[model samples]
Target: NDHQDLREITKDSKMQKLALAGFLKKIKGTYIESLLKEHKLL
Candidate 1:
């Protein structure tokens, strides 16, 4: 694990990450497909 020092995000930094992934999963298009293809993951 990196377990390195993480910088704090101003405002809603942490929450935003979770929300964005959920949003991307909810929609299907070039953005999601391209990203997954690049990573070669599910």
Candidate 2:
């Protein structure tokens, strides 16, 4: 269970990193918080 939990946590963190990178590159003029809220990542 601990291993599974760790795996999921790492995956989520990686996903957030990728999402932020993409958003930063593509939505440079938009509010980050708004994008995150729309994606339900915030």
Candidate 3:
């Protein structure tokens, strides 16, 4: 089940949150969304 667990973790919500964990829109702006889309993580 280790592989299955890893697969589940990579689902978009987890990946998106992990990728943008603490970025503030005030500082990072809207770039985080583009970053996710650019990586196809979204």
lDDT of each: 0.64, 0.64, 0.56
| Candidates 1 and 3 compared by lDDT, better number | 1
Residue range 1-42, candidate 3, lDDT tens digits: 333223344556867775555454423566667777789965
What are the TM-scores, per candidate, against the unseen true structure? Answer: 0.37, 0.37, 0.30
* Count: clashes, candidate 1: 0
User: Per-residue CA lDDT of candidate 1, range 1-42, in tens?
Assistant: 544334465568667776667667654754767767789865
- Per-residue lDDT tens digits for candidate 2, residues 1-42, read 333222244557777887668667755567876777789975
> Candidate 1, overall lDDT?
0.64
Q: Candidate 1: list runs displaced more than 4 Å.
A: 1-10, 29-42
* Candidate 2's TM-score: 0.37
Off by over 4 Å in 2: 1-11, 29-42
Which run of 10 residues does model 1 get worst, by summed lDDT? 1-10
